[PDB]
Design a protein around this ligand. Structure first.
Ligand SMILES: *[C@@H]1O[C@H](CO)[C@@H](O)[C@H](O)[C@H]1NC(C)=O
Lengths: 441, 49
C-alpha cells in the first residue's frame, strides 16, 4: 500500500503518520532522518602551498666572463655579476681584480611541507543529495538504510519500498569555488591556474601534489653578492600561502547557514535544515489487519491534565475509553497543533490512558486518532520557564498559535464593531433613500 | 527548581506552599523560622562605674 507525503528537512525530528487503507485498520508510520548530506561534484583545479627557493652553487669565473641561459624551472632567475673579487678560507679565489664574473641562479619549487600542509582549490557544481532514514511501521521495529534524495531510486527498508523525492530547495552552501585546507572549507574565489599573483594565495600553483609542472609567480630577483663574499643573495615576495593562512578568515564550517556541518570525504554539507522532502513508502500488504480483526474503540473522552508550550513534550492528556477485545491501539494526531510522544497504547475492556504531546499553541485544540476512532482534545497551556534550551523544538509554530482567547475576543470585537457599525451606516443610507422615494410617491 | 515567595516575619508559625514544577507532581514545602536576630553594629564609647 502506497503512502505519499511531504516531510520537513529536519534531522532528528520524526515524521509520524497513519497509513489508512480502506477495509484495514490504520498502520502507524514513523520516518526519521538520521542525517542529510549535500554532496557536490568537485573538480580539483590546483594545489597551493608554501614555496621553497632553490639556489644552485654559483659559477665563479676567474679572469674571464660567462653568460646566462634560460631553463625550464618555475620562476627561474639567472644573472651574471661582473667585477667581483670573492674571498674564501684559502684567501682570494680569483687572480684578476676586475676581469672576474659570478653567475647566480635561483628558482622556485614546492616546499617539503607541501606534502602535508597545502590547500586544494576545487571547482564546485551541483551533485547528489543523500540521506539515511530510520523507519518503523506497525509492529515492525526500527530499520535503517542509506537512500538517494532524487525521487527515483527506491530503497528496501524492513521489506518496505521507500522512494524519497528531491528537496524542495536547490540551495547549497558551496559557491562555484572552494578551498579545502585541513578540515576546513572556504568559499574563496581563488585565481585560475596560471594567473596567480605574487604574495597572494595563488602565487604557487600545482595541478597535483606530485606534478612535475609547477607554476610559480613571485618577484624572485637575484641581488649582487656582497663585496668579497661568495653567496647567492636574492629578494622575493613573502609566500602568499602563509599570508593567506593568516588572513583566511572564517571557514565555511563556521558560517554555513541552516546549521550545515561540513565534511571532506567526500566534500559535503550535512544536516542542512532547508525546505521539505517529498516521500513515498510502500507498506507491505501483510502488515494490514482487517477492521473486524482489530479492537473497536468508542466512548472517547480526552482531558488535558498539564500543558506548557515548551520545546519539549510539555503536554499531558488522559483519554477515557471503552473498547472491545482489549488489544493494542495506534495513537496519532493528524493536526499540526500537537506532536504525540506515544505511538500506541494497550487497551483494556474499559478505562483510560495517558499520552504526552508538544505544542506551540497557548490553547491547543486537536484531533487525536485512536485506531478506527477519534477524539477531540482541548485545553490551555502555560508559558515555559527556561529562556534558553539545548534542544530543538518538537513542534512547528503557526501564525495563530500565540493568539489567546482574550486576544481572539478583542480581535473579534474590533472586527465585529466596525463591521456592524459600517453596515449600520449603509443600512441607514439604504432606508432613508427609500423613505425619500415614498415621499415622492 | 527555584521557588520564590514572601512569608510573614513570624517565629514558630510555618510557611507552607506547594512547589509546582511544570511536568512534575507538586512538592510540599514548609519553611519555619526558629529565631530571628537583629544584630546592630556597636562601638563602645566609654565605661561607667
Ligand atoms: C533508529 O531509532 C532507534 C530508536 O531507539 C535507535 O535505537 C537506532 O539506533 C536508530 N537507528 C539509527 C541508524 O540511528
Amino acid at each position: 500500500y502506497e503512502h505519499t507525503a511531504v516531510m520537513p528537512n529536519k534531522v532528528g525530528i520524526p515524521y509520524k503518520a497513519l497509513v489508512e487503507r480502506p477495509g484495514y485498520a490504520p498502520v502507524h508510520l514513523q520516518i526519521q532522518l538520521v542525517n542529510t548530506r549535500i554532496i557536490p561534484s568537485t573538480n580539483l583545479e590546483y594545489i597551493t602551498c608554501k614555496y621553497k627557493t632553490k639556489v644552485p652553487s654559483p659559477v665563479v669565473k676567474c679572469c674571464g666572463a660567462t653568460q646566462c641561459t634560460s631553463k625550464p624551472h618555475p620562476d627561474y632567475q639567472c644573472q651574471v655579476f661582473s667585477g667581483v673579487y670573492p674571498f674564501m678560507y684559502g684567501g682570494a679565489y680569483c687572480f684578476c681584480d676586475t676581469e672576474n664574473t659570478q653567475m647566480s641562479e635561483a628558482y622556485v619549487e614546492r616546499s617539503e611541507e607541501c606534502s602535508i600542509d597545502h590547500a586544494k582549490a576545487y571547482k564546485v557544481h551541483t551533485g547528489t543529495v543523500q540521506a539515511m532514514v530510520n523507519i518503523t511501521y506497525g509492529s515492525v521495529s526500527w530499520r535503517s538504510a542509506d537512500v538517494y534524495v532524487n525521487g527515483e531510486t527506491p530503497a528496501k527498508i524492513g521489506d518496505a519500498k521507500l522512494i524519497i523525492g528531491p528537496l524542495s530547495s536547490a540551495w547549497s552552501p558551496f559557491d562555484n569555488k572552494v578551498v579545502v585546507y585541513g578540515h576546513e572549507v572556504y568559499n574563496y574565489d581563488f585565481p585560475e591556474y596560471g594567473t596567480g599573483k605574487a604574495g597572494s594565495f595563488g602565487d604557487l600553483q600545482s595541478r597535483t601534489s606530485t606534478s612535475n609542472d609547477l607554476y610559480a609567480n613571485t618577484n624572485l630577483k637575484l641581488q649582487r653578492p656582497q663585496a668579497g663574499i661568495v653567496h647567492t643573495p636574492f629578494t622575493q615576495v613573502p609566500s602568499g600561502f602563509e599570508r593567506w593562512k593568516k588572513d583566511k578568515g572564517a571557514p565555511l564550517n563556521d558560517v554555513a547557514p541552516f546549521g550545515c556541518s561540513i565534511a571532506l570525504e567526500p566534500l559535503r554539507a550535512e544536516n542542512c535544515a532547508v525546505g521539505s522532502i517529498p516521500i513515498s513508502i510502500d507498506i507491505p500488504d501483510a502488515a494490514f489487519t482487517r477492521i473486524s480483526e482489530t479492537p473497536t474503540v468508542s466512548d472517547l473522552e480526552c482531558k488535558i491534565t498539564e500543558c506548557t508550550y515548551a520545546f519539549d513534550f510539555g503536554g499531558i492528556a488522559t483519554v477515557a475509553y471503552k473498547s472491545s477485545k482489549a488489544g493494542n491501539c495506534p495513537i496519532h494526531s493528524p493536526s499540526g497543533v500537537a506532536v504525540i510522544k506515544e505511538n500506541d497504547v494497550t487497551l483494556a475492556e474499559s478505562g483510560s490512558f495517558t499520552f504526552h504531546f508538544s505544542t506551540a499553541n497557548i490553547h491547543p485544540a486537536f484531533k487525536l486518532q485512536v485506531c478506527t476512532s477519534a477524539v477531540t482534545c482541548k485545553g490551555d497551556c502555560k508559558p515555559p520557564k527556561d529562556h534558553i534550551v539545548d534542544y530543538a523544538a518538537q513542534h512547528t509554530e503557526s501564525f495563530t498559535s500565540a493568539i489567546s482567547a482574550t486576544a481572539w475576543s478583542w480581535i473579534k470585537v474590533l472586527v465585529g464593531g466596525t463591521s456592524a457599525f459600517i453596515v449600520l451606516g449603509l443600512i441607514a443610507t439604504a432606508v432613508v433613500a427609500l423613505v425619500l422615494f415614498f415621499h415622492r410617491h
